[PDB]
């Protein structure tokens, strides 16, 4: 619903002759998806990494603590891929990450 | 390239034509080491460790019985070139560990 409202506002701005960047601000969200988080860690963009403790198969995340240690990223193993899915509006998330936040946070 | 002689037999034989050089085909780039690939391979190597036959070969290299180690690597892997390359890689591993310690 939020994306639909943002798209309607951006379409209104385009119709009135303004770019979508004039009406929309830079977003700040958590990062999820295993390939995306691994890419962010390799590019050293992720500030904090949280890995679910119960990923089956375990090979998907068994290298992730070593990768975070080599890249110098703070990582933590947390209980609940369902608990991470509640963050990312899914049933299950294997790993989440923060790259950057707002100034008040 | 060496110009051909124009004769039917001998060294550099064949009909005389001016050879040109070609840009190297991207299908022939296979085997070249990539930065991400070697990074991933090093990470997986330190995560997974070694196979028991590699550990036996490392013990043989540590004791210095190089001929016995090469024979063991040949009878394990199957062929002489693979055995030699694996023994060289384990030389690199042992030298890295010794220079670390």
């Amino acid at each position: 619903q939020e994306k639909k409202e943002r798209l309607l506002r951006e379409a209104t701005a385009i119709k009135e002759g303004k770019k979508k960047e004039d009406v929309s601000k830079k977003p700040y969200t958590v990062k999820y998806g295993l390939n995306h988080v691994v890419g962010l860690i390799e590019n050293k963009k992720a500030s904090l990494v949280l890995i679910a403790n119960d990923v089956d198969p375990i090979e998907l995340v068994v290298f992730l603590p070593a990768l975070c240690r080599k890249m110098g990223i703070p990582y933590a193993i947390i209980k609940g891929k369902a608990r991470l899915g509640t963050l990312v509006h899914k049933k299950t998330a294997a790993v989440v990450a923060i790259t950057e936040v707002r100034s008040e946070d | 390239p060496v110009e051909r002689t124009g004769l039917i037999r001998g060294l550099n034989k064949g009909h005389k034509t001016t050879r040109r050089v070609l840009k190297e085909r991207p299908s022939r780039r296979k085997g070249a080491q990539s930065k991400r690939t070697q990074f991933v391979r090093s990470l997986i190597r330190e995560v997974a460790g070694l196979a028991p036959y590699e550990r036996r070969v490392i013990e043989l290299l540590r004791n210095g019985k190089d001929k016995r180690a090469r024979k063991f690597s040949k009878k394990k892997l199957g062929t002489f070139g693979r055995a030699k390359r694996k023994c060289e890689e384990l030389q690199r591993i042992i030298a890295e560990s010794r220079r670390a310690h």
Binding site: G39, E42 | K35, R36
Partner: peptide, 8 residues
């Protein structure tokens, strides 16, 4: 850093 490719 390790990169898969050059990006925009």
């Amino acid at each position: 850093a390790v990169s898969v490719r050059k990006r925009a």
